[PDB]
Amino acid sequence: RELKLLLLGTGESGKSTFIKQMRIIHGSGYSDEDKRGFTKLVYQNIFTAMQAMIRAMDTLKIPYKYEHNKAHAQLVREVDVEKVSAFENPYVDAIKSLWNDPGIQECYDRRREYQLSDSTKYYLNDLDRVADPSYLPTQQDVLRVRVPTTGIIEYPFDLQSVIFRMVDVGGQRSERRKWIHCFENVTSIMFLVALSEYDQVLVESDNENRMEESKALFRTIITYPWFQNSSVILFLNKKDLLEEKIMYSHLVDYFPEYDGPQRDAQAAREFILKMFVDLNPDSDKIIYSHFTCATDTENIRFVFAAVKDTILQLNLK
Amino acid sequence: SELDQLRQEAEQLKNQIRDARKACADATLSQITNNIDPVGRIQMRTRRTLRGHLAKIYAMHWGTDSRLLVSASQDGKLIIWDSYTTNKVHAIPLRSSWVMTCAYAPSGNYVACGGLDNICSIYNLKTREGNVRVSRELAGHTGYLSCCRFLDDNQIVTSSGDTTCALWDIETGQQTTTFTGHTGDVMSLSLAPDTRLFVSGACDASAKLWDVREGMCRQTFTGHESDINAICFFPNGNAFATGSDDATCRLFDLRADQELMTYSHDNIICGITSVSFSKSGRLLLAGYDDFNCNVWDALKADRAGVLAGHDNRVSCLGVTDDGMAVATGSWDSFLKIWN
Amino acid sequence: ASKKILLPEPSIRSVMQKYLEDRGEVTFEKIFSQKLGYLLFRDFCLKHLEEAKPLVEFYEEIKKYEKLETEEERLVCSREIFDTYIMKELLACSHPFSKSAIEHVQGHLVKKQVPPDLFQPYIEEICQNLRGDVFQKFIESDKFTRFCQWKNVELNIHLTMNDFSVHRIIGRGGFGEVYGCRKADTGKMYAMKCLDKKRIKMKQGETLALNERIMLSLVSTGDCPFIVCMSYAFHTPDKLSFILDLMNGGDLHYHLSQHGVFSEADMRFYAAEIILGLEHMHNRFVVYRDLKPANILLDEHGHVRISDLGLACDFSKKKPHASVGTHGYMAPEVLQKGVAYDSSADWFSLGCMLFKLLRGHSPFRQHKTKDKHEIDRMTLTMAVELPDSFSPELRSLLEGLLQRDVNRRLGCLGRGAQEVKESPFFRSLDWQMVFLQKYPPPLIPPRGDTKGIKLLDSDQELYRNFPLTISERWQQEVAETVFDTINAETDRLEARKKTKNKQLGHEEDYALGKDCIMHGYMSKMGNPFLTQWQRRYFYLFPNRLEWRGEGEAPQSLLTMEEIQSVEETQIKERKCLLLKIRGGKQFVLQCDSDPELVQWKKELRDAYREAQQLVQRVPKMKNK
Amino acid sequence: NNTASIAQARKLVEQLKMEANIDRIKVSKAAADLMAYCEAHAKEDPLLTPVPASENPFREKKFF
Ligand SMILES: Nc1nc2c(ncn2[C@@H]2O[C@H](COP(=O)(O)OP(=O)(O)O)[C@@H](O)[C@H]2O)c(=O)[nH]1
Ligand code: ALF
Ligand SMILES: [Mg+2]
């Protein structure tokens, strides 16, 4: 017996990462043949990230402390995103030096003002492993890669109880067009929200707030008449990023109705959660919330174990 | 008190001016000129006719080359003629149908016009692309543009029905100076050879000498019993003649600051529309509202001749800078060159 | 369609746009409402504009939704409309509509309910989006120019009989016969109720002739399947014409006399269609008063329409009281001399007929007595004894419809026809299927001298404001026949002269960049003994009226100064303009259409008065 | 309404002061000057004294 599940959400919210975790836990775990597949994409993320950071220093007008690293910056600027074969010497030391420059660090700490990526610090803090000739990406490396999903894809995983046919999709406004065509017999909806979005603007529209886009998109999905029968599962992803961001960026600023103590993940979590829960048109319906981290297999196991049980408790009976 | 003492000061200061003038009035020009030989009879002949305008012609103005001339007409068009060849160098259609005046630049590049549009529209003949393109909309006047004359390519003086004149900077499209003073619609104006002075005629039955430089009225001449319709400078720049709805012309000397001469006759009952001097100044040519256009001896005040070549009112007229010919525009749709 | 509808050249737009703007006709609600405006407007949005296109499509799909019959269809459809036009755009935030409208539709669709007006709030908000810039861009476009051309044709409709081919003779009447004809312009089939004016005054019946025209006018607008509606009214010197819907199937009295009485299920059909006909007239505050089988006509297929509106009456302002109509079917209040009545009377008249359809005689004449005071006494006095055979559903209906008291009369209690429709009799019927004529009729019909009296000018004056055209009708008639094909034809002929005049010498830029107020073709003369008629293209400027031929700019004009008076004078019984010029000289103009003539009259008068006012306070330009 | 009338009446008297403060010339000399101008330029004036038809652009020639 199969069940249709939609992973819906704003861009970069961890929909494709959630899938990668289902494959680790249930489906065909990541082989060492497959792990090589991502090596190229790892290198590209490091370039794409660094380049996006180099440009951002010229936008925000942040000075390089070591002026030597201006030569390395031009070196990296002309590197083509897609023409990356491997991570070799002329760029390795240049990109590590760049990263170690305290001007780049000021720019990185202002990552809210321009679109960077969510795994840049993870990779750039670990350039030694990446530049090794026989560098084989770990299961974490694979979870951390940014592979912009576009268009509907079906990933059917099967536990020893039931088949879950999960639907990964693209998050950006243009990708949301394609969504309509598999809204048919949906068992339940897994809506993902990135908790660290609160102080960020959309890539699809640098004017508007990412958290507020999700806030609207959730309300849109909820109120859809033919999901009245379906179950709703809210996934407040990137808990671990909120735990960093809230120490310097206050939630009070971007959502004025917040009373709680700033520099608190747990107080912010609950407020943010309530915002999404209060968008339910009728509290006669129940929204099942979980605070999650899609790059943590140990967290997704425990969560999805409880989520599966909720889906089946509800849908079998 | 304050306004009555100032009113009685006005009317004493006024009589100080009349006495300062009567003091100069030892002889008249009619006395002085008795002796000089009469000008004779100026038998003038229609050399050209300029057919093209579809209705009344309201104004015209010679180019400094003594060959090209613009003319504005009721038909909403501003035509440039080659007097020598009768061929139209340009036939410019206007944005406003209500044109009343036009003015060839001394530079030859620009021509200006205007009317009830309350704008002095400046046109460019020598364009980048060789077209007839509009350089500027000189807006600012609050009444009809009655007349205007180019100082050069970038400066132009204009009279209006708001009872003021104005100097413009064509670049800035802005009134450099404003010559306020008249208490009636300003019908006409005339630049002196020295571009630093100009006179203007109005419906207040008076003319005024203005200082272009500074922007003040230097002298005011009266004597006409009705509107002054046209005015222009004597060749040297020390006198000027005025045409009026009182059926008379008059000559005024600036330095003597009074009227020298009257040009009129019991037979002439309708008003003067326009005036111009011959190159030497001996002849005053007055356009009339009886389709005629009489030639006066400026010194003798005798009617030397008549140009009677139009079926309707002679609205406008001019003389070339080389004095070689007289143009006369009319309400009958034709200009005519004379010798 | 033998006679070619000739379409004015696009130079007509200058006159029309001024003619229409003067009447505030150039608004979105005025033009979008008209069928030919919608059709031109929607072509513009789809073909040319980018962001207009999906709004029209939404409006289109909703309009299709509205006309869906079954709920099983509307349920399927309401989703696709939502999923495509609402959800798909709403997910991406490119959905420019209110939360109210969105919530309104979800609020319904969640509850699984699909009213045909479900998307009605969206319809209104699609206008707001099309009403602003999009409408202005359309006015600027060539499609508005095309609308002006078509609108000119409409507003210059003059109908002789030469416009109609007469196929048969389908009737006789009180004052003239009735033909069945084809309008040559479009080929549309109509019925021509033609009346002799002389016979009218001979039977002093000028009131019921003119009443018919006014009543038909009130009724004919708003598309009605169950009334013989008017499309055009006109007259020749002696003949008075109405162009009505073609009822080739004869009347219901004949078909009753032929068929005998009708079944209860067969009568139900007729009653239901007559009910919606009565509902239509009552919603326009008109009473029919002459409701009887003879005044019900059948079409080819056997469907019905209400006919002779002559005895009808408008009660929006004041209610009547006299006893008008056939005195076998009239109500108590109508009979009661000087007692006021309204729509109520029709429902009493209905009962009398529906009874007569089942029994073969009116419910009051016994032994067909033909006695006014007998029948009318029984109307006021006695209640009908309904035969035992009459089912209880019909028993309920005719006891409700035939009350003497109007306070207990069915259809009069408050909600009009909707009370009658609810009756347990019509409980089987889906009332919109009645409207859509989807119910099959019970009876398909088969195929088969004191003229010497004088006619005054006083009589002719009565029929001066008679002739009329009904825009809705004419536009539909055009829409459903020639519209697309004339557009196709005109599109070529104009494009043909665009290529021609391109290669000869660039035309039609004389009026541009100046203060020209209006320009168009007209015809000019001077006086009878010398000059003749000449067609020229005029340009009206504030101070002059220039005119030219092809291959030149204007070489002759006329100043506003010299125009003394514009006056409407007729030349050989044809409206023309008379320009009196200062020098005792005259000058007359003549136009193609009525709209043009009217606008040249207005604009010249406006222009010369305004010139002479202005010039006279300018010393250079003024005479003395 | 004194402030307008007074502001106007002052311009007048400040203007009349302007006009009265000029050194005028005896009319006789004004005339003599103008007469003596024409006397000088009467030769250079073809309207006054008819020029040769050869020198006349409006008679002798059609080519210019
Ligand atoms: N640290 C952290 N990174 C995350 C989390 N979720 C996603 N990411 C990373 O951020 C990027 C966006 O996730 P992805 O699944 O590709 O985005 P989506 O499918 O478009 O929603 C990926 O590179 C992920 O590795 C999270 O909870 N914590
Ligand atoms: F939501 Al995405 F790549 F931004 F799947
Ligand atoms: Mg994805």
Side-chain angles (χ1 to χ4, degrees):
Chain A
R1 188 186 170 179
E2 66 145 25
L3 294 173
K4 202 178 198 178
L5 294 178
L6 303 183
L7 304 186
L8 304 181
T10 311
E12 318 192 36
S13 61
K15 301 181 287 292
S16 293
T17 317
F18 208 98
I19 291 296
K20 294 182 187 177
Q21 290 278 27
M22 292 294 98
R23 174 173 149 170
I24 290 162
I25 300 161
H26 299 289
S28 56
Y30 282 86
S31 173
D32 293 303
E33 297 180 25
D34 314 340
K35 280 173 172 182
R36 295 162 193 181
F38 297 98
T39 51
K40 295 177 183 185
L41 295 163
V42 167
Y43 312 138
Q44 293 178 72
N45 281 193
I46 293 167
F47 279 112
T48 310
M50 190 54 64
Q51 288 176 18
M53 206 144 47
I54 303 255
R55 297 158 190 180
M57 285 192 70
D58 228 57
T59 305
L60 303 174
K61 299 150 188 163
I62 299 167
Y64 289 74
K65 313 315 175 200
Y66 298 81
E67 201 150 296
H68 152 59
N69 283 331
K70 295 192 174 167
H72 288 149
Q74 308 312 327
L75 173 56
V76 176
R77 256 182 161 164
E78 296 157 20
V79 181
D80 288 21
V81 167
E82 297 155 297
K83 294 194 171 187
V84 174
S85 42
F87 202 57
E88 299 302 323
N89 304 346
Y91 299 115
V92 166
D93 288 24
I95 289 175
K96 195 173 180 192
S97 176
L98 272 162
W99 180 235
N100 196 201
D101 202 298
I104 288 281
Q105 293 292 314
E106 176 59 32
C107 194
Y108 177 56
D109 283 312
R110 305 182 79 187
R111 65 205 113 162
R112 76 180 165 197
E113 290 160 63
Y114 63 102
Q115 306 304 334
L116 199 39
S117 183
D118 300 298
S119 303
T120 61
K121 177 184 173 189
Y122 172 92
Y123 287 122
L124 294 162
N125 283 18
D126 212 324
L127 291 173
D128 284 28
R129 284 194 312 95
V130 175
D132 188 71
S134 290
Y135 156 65
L136 179 47
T138 57
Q139 202 173 245
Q140 190 62 201
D141 286 354
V142 173
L143 290 161
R144 295 273 183 168
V145 299
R146 177 50 191 158
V147 180
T149 310
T150 53
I152 300 156
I153 323 176
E154 294 166 19
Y155 294 98
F157 304 107
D158 60 319
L159 185 62
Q160 297 150 316
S161 311
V162 66
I163 275 173
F164 284 119
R165 188 153 143 188
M166 290 200 178
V167 188
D168 185 33
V169 297
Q172 294 69 18
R173 284 169 167 165
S174 34
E175 302 301 327
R176 307 203 190 113
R177 300 276 181 176
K178 303 176 177 184
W179 283 16
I180 304 299
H181 300 80
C182 55
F183 276 24
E184 293 170 25
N185 289 32
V186 179
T187 307
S188 195
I189 290 169
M190 293 182 149
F191 200 95
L192 281 146
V193 169
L195 285 166
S196 54
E197 281 177 313
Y198 70 107
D199 65 327
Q200 306 188 253
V201 288
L202 294 159
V203 66
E204 52 260 39
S205 171
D206 51 63
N207 187 275
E208 289 147 296
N209 197 240
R210 288 198 169 187
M211 178 77 82
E212 199 165 10
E213 176 86 308
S214 313
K215 195 173 151 199
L217 180 63
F218 188 70
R219 166 71 170 187
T220 305
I221 294 294
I222 294 305
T223 56
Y224 189 67
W226 297 270
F227 294 150
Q228 185 67 29
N229 305 249
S230 297
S231 301
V232 188
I233 313 181
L234 192 63
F235 279 92
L236 301 202
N237 200 41
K238 314 213 184 180
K239 61 158 207 174
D240 60 324
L241 297 191
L242 175 57
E243 192 178 330
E244 298 184 47
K245 295 207 81 170
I246 203 78
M247 298 294 95
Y248 38 89
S249 183
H250 309 296
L251 178 59
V252 190
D253 301 331
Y254 301 78
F255 285 87
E257 208 214 310
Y258 176 48
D259 287 323
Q262 60 207 176
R263 309 185 200 176
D264 196 288
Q266 200 178 240
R269 272 164 135 204
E270 299 294 327
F271 176 80
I272 290 166
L273 173 52
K274 186 154 184 174
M275 298 214 81
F276 283 94
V277 173
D278 282 348
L279 290 163
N280 196 344
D282 59 308
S283 68
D284 208 15
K285 185 63 174 176
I286 298 301
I287 301 160
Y288 306 119
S289 65
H290 298 266
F291 305 117
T292 55
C293 181
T295 72
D296 192 16
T297 305
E298 303 311 88
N299 188 219
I300 296 294
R301 267 185 215 156
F302 181 80
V303 178
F304 187 82
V307 173
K308 182 218 111 190
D309 292 22
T310 304
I311 291 164
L312 289 170
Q313 265 276 66
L314 212 39
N315 204 224
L316 289 178
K317 308 176 186 174
Chain B
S1 165
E2 186 188 356
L3 194 51
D4 201 295
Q5 76 181 56
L6 202 59
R7 199 163 182 179
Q8 297 305 266
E9 193 196 335
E11 290 157 309
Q12 289 170 75
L13 225 175
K14 214 161 281 191
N15 286 40
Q16 187 190 344
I17 290 166
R18 291 166 196 166
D19 294 16
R21 290 167 173 180
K22 282 191 191 187
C24 301
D26 55 342
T28 60
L29 182 59
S30 296
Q31 288 159 12
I32 292 157
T33 57
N34 268 349
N35 210 327
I36 67 186
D37 288 10
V39 72
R41 283 162 212 171
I42 304 298
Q43 275 275 45
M44 212 90 80
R45 281 199 210 171
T46 312
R47 303 297 159 178
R48 301 275 179 284
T49 300
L50 298 183
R51 308 191 171 74
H53 284 308
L54 314 165
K56 290 178 179 190
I57 302 162
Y58 285 125
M60 64 84 49
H61 191 226
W62 285 96
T64 42
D65 69 328
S66 308
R67 194 187 181 198
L68 302 175
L69 56 148
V70 274
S71 60
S73 162
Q74 177 179 36
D75 66 0
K77 285 171 196 158
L78 185 80
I79 301 172
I80 303 187
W81 310 74
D82 184 346
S83 58
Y84 287 8
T85 77
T86 313
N87 300 315
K88 293 160 185 158
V89 182
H90 289 103
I92 297 172
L94 293 158
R95 296 189 192 165
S96 167
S97 284
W98 295 104
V99 68
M100 289 176 69
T101 187
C102 59
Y104 225 131
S107 30
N109 312 317
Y110 280 44
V111 304
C113 70
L116 309 194
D117 42 294
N118 289 25
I119 292 164
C120 182
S121 314
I122 277 63
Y123 281 74
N124 194 27
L125 309 178
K126 301 184 185 175
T127 315
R128 204 63 45 194
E129 304 128 270
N131 277 39
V132 280
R133 209 192 198 187
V134 189
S135 302
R136 272 283 167 184
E137 297 284 40
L138 302 180
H141 276 304
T142 76
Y144 60 81
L145 204 85
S146 61
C147 165
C148 54
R149 297 298 185 216
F150 276 112
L151 293 174
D152 53 51
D153 258 309
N154 206 48
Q155 281 185 124
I156 178 165
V157 191
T158 75
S159 59
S160 178
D162 60 48
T163 87
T164 77
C165 290
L167 170 60
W168 299 77
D169 175 27
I170 291 167
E171 221 82 288
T172 56
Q174 201 75 308
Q175 288 187 14
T176 309
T177 311
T178 301
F179 304 84
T180 55
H182 279 290
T183 73
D185 293 352
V186 192
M187 296 307 300
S188 185
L189 68 86
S190 173
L191 302 167
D194 307 15
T195 56
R196 56 176 177 176
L197 288 174
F198 85 90
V199 296
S200 87
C203 297
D204 59 44
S206 79
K208 295 198 171 216
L209 182 56
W210 304 92
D211 205 338
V212 172
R213 298 267 173 169
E214 320 309 337
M216 76 191 73
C217 171
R218 299 226 145 202
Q219 295 157 249
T220 294
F221 312 80
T222 61
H224 280 294
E225 306 191 58
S226 189
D227 305 355
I228 292 183
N229 301 299
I231 191 172
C232 65
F233 262 100
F234 190 86
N236 74 1
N238 292 12
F240 66 95
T242 58
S244 170
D245 272 352
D246 74 14
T248 81
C249 290
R250 297 182 198 270
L251 178 58
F252 296 103
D253 195 302
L254 306 178
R255 297 164 299 137
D257 199 25
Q258 69 208 288
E259 181 188 317
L260 298 183
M261 188 67 95
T262 291
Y263 309 90
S264 66
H265 196 218
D266 304 295
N267 302 4
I268 296 185
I269 300 167
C270 62
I272 295 79
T273 59
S274 51
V275 286
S276 210
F277 279 110
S278 51
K279 192 166 167 293
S280 69
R282 190 76 201 285
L283 303 176
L284 181 66
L285 294 154
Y288 290 82
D289 184 21
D290 57 357
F291 340 134
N292 276 331
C293 173
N294 298 195
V295 194
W296 298 94
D297 195 336
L299 304 182
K300 287 274 192 172
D302 289 332
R303 190 172 43 204
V306 187
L307 323 199
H310 294 294
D311 292 342
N312 210 330
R313 173 195 289 204
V314 180
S315 75
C316 54
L317 66 90
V319 172
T320 56
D321 296 50
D322 60 352
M324 199 75 72
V326 170
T328 72
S330 177
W331 276 14
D332 66 16
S333 309
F334 306 112
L335 293 94
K336 281 190 160 194
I337 311 302
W338 302 72
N339 274 146
Chain C
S2 45
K3 279 277 189 160
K4 295 145 191 172
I5 278 169
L6 193 73
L7 212 61
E9 280 193 327
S11 51
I12 198 73
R13 196 263 201 75
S14 189
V15 176
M16 283 300 289
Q17 195 173 20
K18 284 216 155 177
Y19 179 84
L20 299 172
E21 282 178 347
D22 276 353
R23 298 161 157 73
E25 297 272 287
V26 188
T27 63
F28 178 72
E29 298 292 320
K30 296 286 153 233
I31 291 185
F32 192 87
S33 176
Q34 299 171 48
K35 182 162 194 193
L36 303 191
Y38 171 71
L39 294 176
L40 290 159
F41 180 82
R42 71 171 276 281
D43 280 16
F44 175 75
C45 297
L46 297 162
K47 294 170 191 167
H48 310 245
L49 258 169
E50 306 291 357
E51 62 177 311
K53 174 161 189 166
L55 298 165
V56 175
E57 291 179 24
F58 201 174
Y59 184 84
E60 284 273 353
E61 291 281 329
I62 292 166
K63 268 280 166 294
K64 298 280 80 48
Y65 167 83
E66 287 178 338
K67 294 144 205 165
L68 287 184
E69 301 182 14
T70 59
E71 187 196 58
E72 206 163 316
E73 279 173 5
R74 270 142 61 233
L75 203 57
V76 170
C77 178
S78 68
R79 182 163 194 184
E80 290 158 37
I81 289 180
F82 186 103
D83 270 326
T84 310
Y85 293 89
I86 297 170
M87 192 64 181
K88 196 166 175 162
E89 267 202 317
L90 196 66
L91 281 171
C93 315
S94 66
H95 188 73
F97 293 98
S98 74
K99 206 176 182 175
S100 171
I102 297 156
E103 285 187 57
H104 175 272
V105 173
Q106 289 176 326
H108 279 72
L109 289 171
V110 171
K111 297 166 192 166
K112 310 175 192 164
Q113 70 207 14
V114 285
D117 62 330
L118 167 58
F119 293 107
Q120 183 58 228
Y122 266 103
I123 285 170
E124 296 181 271
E125 297 196 353
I126 293 158
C127 300
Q128 288 153 52
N129 294 328
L130 298 168
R131 205 159 60 211
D133 286 288
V134 173
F135 178 73
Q136 295 298 318
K137 286 184 182 181
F138 160 79
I139 293 294
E140 285 184 25
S141 84
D142 297 12
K143 301 272 185 173
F144 177 67
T145 321
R146 181 58 50 72
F147 176 80
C148 298
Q149 297 177 250
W150 276 111
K151 197 77 175 165
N152 191 288
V153 174
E154 176 170 58
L155 298 164
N156 194 30
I157 280 170
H158 298 314
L159 290 190
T160 61
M161 293 206 49
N162 183 230
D163 313 298
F164 302 96
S165 315
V166 182
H167 287 208
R168 301 186 197 179
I169 303 160
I170 296 175
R172 287 146 185 166
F175 312 86
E177 73 282 303
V178 179
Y179 299 82
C181 37
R182 172 175 290 263
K183 197 200 193 183
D185 311 33
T186 47
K188 180 64 175 296
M189 287 284 274
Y190 284 118
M192 181 178 288
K193 182 170 171 174
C194 180
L195 314 175
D196 176 40
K197 289 173 177 176
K198 301 201 175 201
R199 280 152 142 182
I200 313 303
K201 191 172 83 87
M202 194 200 72
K203 308 178 186 183
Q204 304 185 60
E206 286 92 318
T207 300
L208 78 144
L210 291 162
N211 194 14
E212 202 169 47
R213 206 278 293 175
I214 300 156
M215 294 296 95
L216 276 159
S217 176
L218 297 184
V219 174
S220 288
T221 44
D223 199 71
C224 175
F226 316 104
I227 301 168
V228 176
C229 297
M230 211 214 310
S231 291
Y232 316 108
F234 70 87
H235 58 102
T236 71
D238 57 306
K239 311 206 170 183
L240 210 76
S241 275
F242 301 99
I243 308 305
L244 307 181
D245 288 322
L246 184 51
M247 297 293 90
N248 54 327
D251 80 78
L252 197 64
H253 174 233
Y254 164 84
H255 284 302
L256 181 140
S257 180
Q258 198 79 20
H259 177 276
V261 300
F262 288 93
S263 174
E264 215 178 319
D266 292 338
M267 183 277 292
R268 185 196 318 288
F269 173 86
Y270 291 124
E273 298 204 337
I274 296 156
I275 282 155
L276 293 183
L278 287 166
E279 181 183 313
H280 186 87
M281 295 187 291
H282 291 191
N283 283 216
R284 291 160 169 75
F285 306 95
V286 178
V287 195
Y288 187 66
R289 317 202 302 201
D290 202 15
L291 192 63
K292 66 207 186 199
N295 275 323
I296 285 71
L297 306 175
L298 285 81
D299 71 336
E300 186 165 23
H301 304 291
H303 288 275
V304 284
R305 279 188 160 76
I306 307 180
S307 183
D308 203 336
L309 276 158
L311 296 75
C313 169
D314 188 351
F315 72 96
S316 62
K317 303 195 177 198
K318 186 167 179 170
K319 301 181 182 188
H321 36 279
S323 61
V324 180
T326 303
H327 40 263
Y329 312 85
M330 301 193 309
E333 336 96 316
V334 185
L335 294 163
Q336 283 172 6
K337 300 173 186 178
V339 173
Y341 65 87
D342 65 332
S343 62
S344 61
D346 278 347
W347 301 116
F348 194 97
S349 322
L350 182 59
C352 297
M353 174 166 59
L354 302 193
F355 179 91
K356 198 252 195 171
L357 288 175
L358 306 165
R359 283 286 148 196
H361 58 64
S362 320
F364 301 118
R365 75 188 152 199
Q366 307 299 303
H367 317 269
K368 298 184 187 175
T369 191
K370 190 176 164 180
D371 188 354
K372 183 153 186 154
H373 296 314
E374 175 70 291
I375 300 161
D376 295 332
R377 178 184 159 189
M378 207 66 66
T379 304
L380 303 172
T381 307
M382 201 67 75
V384 293
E385 290 193 19
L386 302 169
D388 202 3
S389 58
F390 280 18
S391 98
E393 322 304 319
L394 188 72
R395 210 88 74 106
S396 170
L397 190 73
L398 295 171
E399 285 179 0
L401 289 169
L402 295 164
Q403 294 284 334
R404 274 101 63 180
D405 196 350
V406 183
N407 302 121
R408 317 190 203 178
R409 192 94 56 76
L410 187 55
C412 313
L413 315 182
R415 303 164 298 165
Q418 186 64 52
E419 305 186 2
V420 176
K421 294 192 278 188
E422 283 166 23
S423 185
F425 191 66
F426 304 106
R427 198 177 134 211
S428 51
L429 302 180
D430 181 344
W431 277 96
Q432 196 174 27
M433 302 304 191
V434 181
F435 192 83
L436 301 189
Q437 289 163 310
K438 296 281 166 166
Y439 285 114
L443 183 87
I444 296 170
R447 67 186 170 173
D449 301 343
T450 156
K451 310 184 185 181
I453 193 167
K454 70 194 170 182
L455 185 56
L456 288 63
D457 287 10
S458 299
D459 310 340
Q460 292 292 321
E461 174 58 20
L462 283 160
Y463 310 105
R464 172 149 184 170
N465 302 161
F466 183 91
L468 170 65
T469 285
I470 287 176
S471 287
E472 272 204 323
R473 295 269 144 177
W474 177 88
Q475 283 200 20
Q476 177 52 33
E477 179 193 313
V478 164
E480 73 198 1
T481 61
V482 303
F483 190 71
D484 295 57
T485 77
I486 294 283
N487 283 320
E489 171 62 45
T490 295
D491 275 314
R492 307 184 320 175
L493 303 192
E494 293 183 355
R496 181 175 145 191
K497 293 178 191 160
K498 173 152 188 171
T499 310
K500 182 206 163 173
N501 288 189
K502 170 76 182 182
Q503 300 177 37
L504 296 190
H506 200 76
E507 306 296 349
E508 311 189 324
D509 45 337
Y510 189 68
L512 303 176
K514 309 175 186 164
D515 64 353
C516 175
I517 71 175
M518 175 172 83
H519 55 79
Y521 291 101
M522 308 174 76
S523 324
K524 64 166 186 71
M525 214 208 183
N527 87 294
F529 278 92
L530 295 165
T531 56
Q532 313 190 343
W533 293 101
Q534 297 175 17
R535 193 172 211 270
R536 304 292 164 188
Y537 196 68
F538 290 69
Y539 296 81
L540 183 46
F541 291 90
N543 71 330
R544 58 173 187 281
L545 176 55
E546 292 185 351
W547 67 74
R548 37 80 84 169
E550 305 290 353
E552 65 160 16
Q555 301 298 84
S556 204
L557 61 74
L558 198 72
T559 58
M560 293 301 138
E561 292 179 327
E562 76 182 322
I563 297 169
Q564 303 193 57
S565 64
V566 190
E567 292 166 20
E568 200 183 349
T569 194
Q570 55 172 11
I571 295 163
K572 291 153 183 171
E573 295 190 48
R574 188 186 178 179
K575 292 162 193 160
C576 279
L577 309 180
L578 174 62
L579 303 192
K580 305 188 177 182
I581 299 160
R582 60 187 174 178
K585 165 183 162 182
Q586 305 211 323
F587 178 95
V588 292
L589 287 158
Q590 189 172 81
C591 280
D592 313 322
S593 67
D594 285 355
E596 293 163 71
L597 197 105
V598 169
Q599 205 61 21
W600 283 104
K601 193 168 83 175
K602 189 223 185 198
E603 291 288 350
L604 287 172
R605 281 177 180 167
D606 289 14
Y608 92 77
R609 307 248 183 72
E610 193 149 340
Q612 290 177 0
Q613 277 175 34
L614 178 52
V615 167
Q616 194 271 326
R617 41 154 273 211
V618 185
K620 273 217 191 182
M621 313 205 223
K622 81 181 215 154
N623 316 134
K624 44 205 180 196
Chain D
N1 293 169
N2 297 321
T3 316
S5 316
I6 290 160
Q8 187 201 358
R10 258 150 195 180
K11 287 166 193 176
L12 163 63
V13 176
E14 280 159 12
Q15 177 57 37
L16 289 181
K17 188 163 190 168
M18 200 117 64
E19 296 177 25
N21 194 46
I22 64 177
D23 282 270
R24 295 159 166 75
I25 285 182
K26 318 211 81 182
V27 167
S28 43
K29 189 197 160 182
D33 271 40
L34 296 170
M35 185 179 61
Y37 182 93
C38 306
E39 184 172 24
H41 297 72
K43 297 187 169 186
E44 297 103 62
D45 188 29
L47 289 149
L48 187 62
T49 51
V51 285
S54 297
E55 294 293 313
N56 191 203
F58 302 85
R59 191 65 185 179
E60 188 77 335
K61 21 191 154 168
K62 186 162 181 183
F63 71 77
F64 295 103

